[PDB]
Amino acid sequence: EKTIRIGFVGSLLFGLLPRIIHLYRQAHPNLRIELYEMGTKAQTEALKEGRIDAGFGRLKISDPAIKHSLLRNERLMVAVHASHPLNQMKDKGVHLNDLIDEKILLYPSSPKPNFSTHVMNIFSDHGLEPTKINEVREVQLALGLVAAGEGISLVPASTQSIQLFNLSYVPLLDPDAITPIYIAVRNMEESTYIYSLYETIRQIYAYEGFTEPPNWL
């Protein structure tokens, strides 16, 4: 069987994932690559059942039947309307403690734990308690709503692929204001095709100029 099945959180298409898949396809003309959008939690049973072979997700959910490699962390940004006071710090950055009384749009609306779990945790980690929280379906909706004046949202740096009139991305300076990208696979030896996918990720990351950590992939 020359088929590999890859699960991915949809919003990862705003980042390096499409470049990775494009290079992978080029490297493997005889391979059928099937792409399936699914939340990070859903990738656990998909891997266990053999419905996907590798899953690109935004957190690590422990299950004995699967294993994980952290690919990288993205910086979080604060998406704001251009008229917001916070946008005056567009070039400099702000901190989590500048955000606690703002209307924050969280996402996605899929089962917990999800992307938003870590976002709320980094507030809790420093004794900060956001007083105005709303959950919306997914990140590009949150961004559109921010542009419409509905509030602010903490978003991965990769979401800057989306640029909207009077939408601005403000850096978050807290060193832990970051969000992980993981690759998850079955808890067994990776296939030749999955090992090749690892090498493709390495190559794209090298083109981006990322420094590899020790014993990476």
- State the residues that interact with its own copies by CB under 8 A: 10-11, 13-14, 16-19, 21-22, 25-26, 35, 37, 81, 137, 140-141, 143-145, 147-150, 161-167
Sign (positive/negative) of CA torsion 4, 107, 71, 24? positive
* Two tokens, residue 14: 């705003």
Query: Helix (H, G, I), strand (E, B), or coil: what is residue 112?
Result: coil
Annotated binding residue 124: no
CB of 101 to its own copies, least distance (A): 19
Choose the contact partner of 37 out of Cl ion, its own copies, none; CB within 5 to 8 A by kind.
its own copies
DSSP H or E stretch at residue 114: none
Binding test (CB under 5 A) with Cl ion, winner from 1, 91, 101, 189:
91
Residue type, 17: L
Residue from 4, 6, 15, 20 touching Cl ion (CB under 5 A): that is 15
CB nearer to its own copies: give 71 or 177: 71
Identity of the amino acid at 26: Q
Question: Distance between CA atoms of 105 and 16, rounded to whole angstroms?
Answer: 24
SS3 152: strand
Residue carrying the six token digits 């004794």: 127
Which of its own copies, Cl ion, none lies near 89, with the C-beta cut-off 5 to 8 A by kind? Cl ion
In the complex with its own copies, the residue whose CB is nearer, 22 or 126, is 22
11 annotated to a ligand binding site: yes
Q: Nearer Cβ to its own copies, position 105 or 154? A: 105
Q: Distance of CA 188 to CAs 48, 79, 85, 185, Å?
A: 11, 40, 51, 8
Tokens standing for residue 146: 């921010």
Which of 80, 78, 45 has the alpha carbon at shortest distance from 63?
45
Find which of Cl ion, its own copies, none residue 145 binds, CB within 5 to 8 Å per kind: its own copies
The SS3 assignment for 110 reads coil
Residue 40 annotated as binding? yes
Count interface residues toward Cl ion (CB under 5 A).
Answer: 9
Supply φ then ψ for residue 187, to 5 degrees: -80, 75
Q: By CB under 5 A, which span of 6-14, 116-124, 125-133, 209-217 interacts with Cl ion?
A: 6-14
Which position's Cβ is nearest Cl ion?
15
Q: List, as residue ranges, the binding site for benzoate.
A: 11, 16, 56, 72, 114, 205
Q: List, as residue ranges, the binding site.
A: 11, 16, 40, 56, 72, 114-115, 205
* Residue ranges binding Cl ion (CB under 5 A): 11, 15-16, 89, 91-92, 108, 138-139
